Amino acid sequence: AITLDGHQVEVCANIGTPKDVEGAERNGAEGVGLYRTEFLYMDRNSLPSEEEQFAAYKAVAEACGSQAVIVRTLDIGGDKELPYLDMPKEMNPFLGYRAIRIAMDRKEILRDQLRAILRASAFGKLRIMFPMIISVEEVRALRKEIEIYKQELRDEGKAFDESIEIGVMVETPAAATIARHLAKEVDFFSIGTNDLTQYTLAVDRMNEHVKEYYQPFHPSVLNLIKQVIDASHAEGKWTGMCGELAGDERATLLLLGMGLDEFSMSAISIPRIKKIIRNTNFEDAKVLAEQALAQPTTDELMTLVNKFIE
Amino acid sequence: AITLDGHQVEVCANIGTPKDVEGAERNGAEGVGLYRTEFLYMDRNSLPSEEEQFAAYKAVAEACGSQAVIVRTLDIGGDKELPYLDMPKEMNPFLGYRAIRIAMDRKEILRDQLRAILRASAFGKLRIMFPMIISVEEVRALRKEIEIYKQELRDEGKAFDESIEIGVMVETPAAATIARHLAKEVDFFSIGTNDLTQYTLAVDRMNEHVKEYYQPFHPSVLNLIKQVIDASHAEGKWTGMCGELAGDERATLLLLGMGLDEFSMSAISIPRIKKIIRNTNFEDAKVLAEQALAQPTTDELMTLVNKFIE
Ligand SMILES: [Mg+2]
Ligand SMILES: [Mg+2]
């Protein structure tokens, strides 16, 4: 989509299973900004094989023609009950043995999924996105593993996209703070704003007694987002957002002004957000974003963006 | 304590009960940078009355003579530790209904403790520090309540320090990010580094399966700390540290170079940290700190700090 003054941003669909692709196309998605892969690991008694995963990743790669699909690696933890995974009981599963920490400790899981994505990337434009990253050394280790797996596929005579792009799903405050360092190691970011908000404000939004503390428009969260966007641009990269905020019509102008390159959302929201983008002036939104992110409280920030919307 | 080139920093004791003052004095504490108040709420079947808290706060205020004592308000949650409050079970208690969130929801708890601290402030130099802060709105709501309690004390004829100082214990990435706004409305910060590390890196340090992810020297944590320090200075305020890192001889020169104004620690660590401070050049430390905080990984940061030490 393009703003009134010619600023282009991508507006993409979040997908949870290959059937969601139909709704994404129906609603004018320009691509898939988040393909969640948890459905492959749930409601079963055994890890999904490389072949089973490949079948699913290939289906989406071909379904989306020439559009890019961002595949998020396993993003699950002990809060979910999947006995075959043998996940330990945890006092704070949101801060625990989850997502990339599982895959990097149980290489079978990482290898099965990354090999499957690599093989599927021969049939469409796929990107790999890692969740729960907090450190440059995690990314460096993952890139080494990817190159090992590429060599294995070459040694086996299996095709893959040798230039597959790699990204971090920025959801920890740590990753937001070292974004400039991370932007040197990966091709893009995508902001998981729901989880970034929870970790930054130290709030589990499903906790009934503190649920009101969860505010994605909190100035700390938005300034961290701006920091990540700016870091990506300083290195010639780009930042998307697959968190719920990207599909929030109260945030579209603000996020545009912040310089967000890509919005990814439940497909039903794509036409509304597209329309806002096409009727926004980027330069004006940039001025509003600067004033908004300078406000000291959520209420004062939101009051400013809402008046500008009117 | 003063550095070789004349930079003064306070070296203070963390205490958890009036009995700890003796050891703080024994070891040369220049004041109390953290008076934990959990001992008043734990190991009992009832809330601690205002009078019981007042007795404990007054005893430390008088024991410390002319020194300042920073009293941290209730900083705990969960059923295990507050069973007489009938706390609900929580999936992620570390992100839940705890500390100031409990007190601002159950106003009797806030009122008993702040009135006791206010009354005790007539007997020595006391400061109030709030944990778990994520927003300016919370500081404003707490200041409003303090002013109500102040007027109640005036109406009852009870003395209190009318200019009692108010601070935030920075442990949430949120507070670190909005530090410049908070510095306008509070008198000081103290960094709770253990919890700031856990929230920033999204890691429960007590979780055996991810304990290796807990890294207080991680560049994101130290850069958040520097952000807090600099924000406090921009507003003519100051920043201390009562987290474990302040008692760590590996971090002293680094924290000094980052501009930390106060170190607070278990009393037995005070002589060694004082000696390092007195044998350090602040200007040289500042250069070191700038280089260290620019490093992309914990290992590169610590290696750089270690080499400078040696
Ligand atoms: Mg997450
Ligand atoms: Mg804490």
- Domain segments of chain B as ranges: 1-310
3-state SS class at A11: strand
Q: Is B145 exposed, middle or buried (0-12, 13-18, 19+ CB in 10 A)?
A: middle
Say how far residue A220 (Cα) sits from the centre of its chain.
Answer: 19
Contact B31, B64 (CB under 8 A): yes
Q: Can you say how many angstroms the Cα of residue B230 is from the centroid of all Cα atoms in its chain?
A: 17
Alpha-carbon span B133 to A102, nearest angstrom: 31
Nearest ligand to residue A175 Cα: 1
User: How far, in Å, is the centroid of ligand 2 from the Cα of B214?
Assistant: 15
From the list A146, A141, A121, the residue with the least C-alpha distance to A70 is A121
Q: Give CA–CA dist B264/A98, Å, rounded.
A: 34
Q: How far is A157 from chain B (nearest CA, A)?
A: 36
State the best of A206, A208, A210 to mutate against chain B, taking most chain B CBs within 10 Å. A210
Instruction: Say if strands B238-241 and B188-191 run parallel, antiparallel, or are unpaired.
Output: parallel
Q: Do B93 and A97 touch (CB under 8 A)?
A: no
Instruction: Identify any residues that bridge with B179 across adjacent strands, giving them in sequence order.
Output: none
How many Å lie between the centroid of ligand 2 and the Cα of residue A202? 10
Q: Which ligand is nearest to the CA of B100?
A: 2
Resolution as reported, in Å = 1.9
Token code pair at residue B217:
């020297």
B-chain residue closest to A173, CA distance: B200
Q: Which two tokens stand for residue B57?
A: 């706060």
Are the C-beta atoms of residues B270 and B242 closer than 8 Å to each other?
no
Identity of residue B28: G
Cβ of A136: how many Cβ atoms within 10 Å?
A: 22
Q: Which residue in the set A135, A207, A297 is minimally distant from B135, CB to CB?
A: A297
Environment class of B189 (CB within 10 Å of its CB; exposed 0-12, middle 13-18, buried 19+): buried
Distance B298 CA to ligand 2 centre (A): 23
Helix (H) or strand (E) holding B68: strand B68-72
Q: Is B67 helix (H, G, I), strand (E, B) or coil?
A: coil
Query: Which residues does chain A have within 8 Å of residue B219's beta carbon, measured at their own beta carbons?
Result: 177-178, 181
Q: Would you say B103 and B43 are in contact if contact means Cβ atoms under 8 Å apart?
A: no
Task: Report the residue of chain A nearest B137, measured CA to CA.
Answer: A297
- CA B54 vs CA A11, A109, B31, B39: distances in Å: 59, 56, 19, 13
Compute the distance between CA of residue B242 and CA of residue B169 in angstroms, rounded to an integer.
9
Q: Tell me the C-alpha distance between A253 and A241, whole Å.
A: 14
Residue of B85, B185, B207, B215 for testing the chain A interface, max A β-carbons within 10 Å: B207
Q: What is the DSSP letter of A297?
A: S
- Residue A89's φ and ψ, nearest 5 degrees, are -65, 135
Q: Which amino acid is at A164?
A: I
Nearest Cα of chain B lies from the Cα of A122 at a distance, in angstroms, of 33
User: Taking Cα atoms as reference points, which of B43, B13, B44, B46 lies closest to residue B31?
Assistant: B13
SS3 A210: coil
> SS3 for A149?
helix
Greatest Cα pair distance in chain B: 60
| Distance from residue B217's CA to the centre of ligand 2 (Å) | 18
Q: What is the CA(B132)–ligand 2 centre distance, in A?
A: 6
Task: Report DSSP state, residue A201.
Answer: T
Distance B259 CA to ligand 1 centre (A): 34
Question: Which residues of A fall within a CB distance of 8 Å from B133?
Answer: none
**Rounded to whole angstroms, how far apart are CA atoms B11 and B32?**
9
Task: Decide: B282 and B259 in contact? Cβ < 8 Å.
Answer: no
What are the angstrom distances between the C-alpha of B275 and each of B7, B218, B279?
Answer: 14, 25, 6
**CA pair distance A44, A96, nearest whole angstrom:** 23
- Between CA A278 and CA A309 the distance in angstroms is 14
Q: What is the maximal distance between C-alpha atoms in chain A? A: 60
Please count the residue pairs, one from chain A and one from chain B, whose beta carbons lie less than 8 angstroms apart: 166
Q: Which residue of B has its CA nearest to A180?
A: B296
- Tell me, what amino acid is at A286? K
8 Å CB contact between A62 and A32: no
Helix (H, G, I), strand (E, B) or coil at A119: helix
Helix axes A107-120, A50-63, angle to 10 degrees: 30
The ligand whose atoms approach the alpha carbon of B38 most closely is 2
**Quick one: three-class SS letters along B4-51?**
CCCCECEEEEEECCHHHHHHHHHCCCCCEEEECCHHHCCCCCCCCCHH
Residues sharing a CB contact under 8 Å with residue B192, sequence separation 6 or more, in sequence order: B131, B169, B170, B171, B242, B243
Min CA distance, B179 vs chain A (Å)? 9
Centroid of ligand 1 to alpha carbon of A195 (angstroms): 5
Which of B82, B105, B199 should be substituted to probe chain A, the one whose Cβ sees the most A Cβ atoms within 10 Å?
Answer: B199
Q: Which residues face B170 on adjacent strands?
A: B191
Alpha-carbon distance B191 to nearest alpha carbon in chain A (angstroms): 15
Dist CA B21 CA B28 (whole Å) = 11
Which stretch of DSSP H or E encloses residue B105?
Answer: helix B100-105
- What span, in angstroms and rounded, lies between the C-alpha atoms of B307 and B180? 33
What ranges in chain A are assigned the alpha helix state H? 20-26, 50-63, 100-105, 107-120, 136-156, 173-177, 179-183, 193-200, 219-234, 252-258, 270-278, 282-293, 298-309
Chain B residue closest in CA terms to A88? B209
Residue whose C-alpha is closest to residue A255's, from A236, A234, A276, A270: A276
Helix (H, G, I), strand (E, B) or coil at A126: strand
Chain A hits for B94, Cβ within 8 Å: 91-92, 95, 202
Residues just before a chain gap in chain A (C–N exceeding 2.5 Å) are none
Amino acid found at A210: V
Contacts of A93 in chain B (CB under 8 A): 91-92
Nearest Cα neighbor of A135 from B186, B287, B215 is B215
Residue B252: count of CB within 10 angstroms of its CB: 26
Helices (H) and strands (E) in chain B, counts: 13, 8
Q: A127, A77, A81: which is closest to A105 by C-alpha?
A: A77
The Å distance, Cα B171 to ligand 2 centre, comes to 6
Number of alpha carbons in the 13 Å side-chain half-sphere of residue A182: 35
Residue of A nearest to B140 (CA): A297
Cβ B207–A95 below 8 Å, yes or no? yes
Distance CA A76, CA A38 (A): 7
Closest CA to A282 of A245, A244, A253: A253
Contacts of B44 (CB under 8 A, 6+ apart): B84
A118 touches A149 (CB < 8 A): yes
Residue whose entry in the numeric block shows the structure tokens 């410049």: B180
Handedness of CA B265, B268, B273, B274 (dihedral sign): positive
Taking an 8 Å cut-off on Cβ atoms, the answer to whether A178 and B219 are in contact is yes
Mention the CATH class of domain A1-310.
Answer: alpha beta
Alpha carbon distance A71, A61 (integer Å): 10
Ramachandran sector of residue B95 (left: φ over 0; alpha: ψ -120 to 50; beta: rest): alpha
Tell me how the structure was determined. X-ray
Structure letter (DSSP) for residue B77? B
Cβ-based contacts of A235 with chain B (< 8 Å):
none
B16: exposed, middle or buried (C-beta count within 10 Å: 0-12, 13-18, 19+)? middle
Bridge partners, residue A189, by sequence: A168, A239
DSSP one-letter string for A235-289: TT-EEEE-SGGGG-TTTHHHHHHHT--EEEE-GGGHHHHHHHHHT--HHHHHHHH
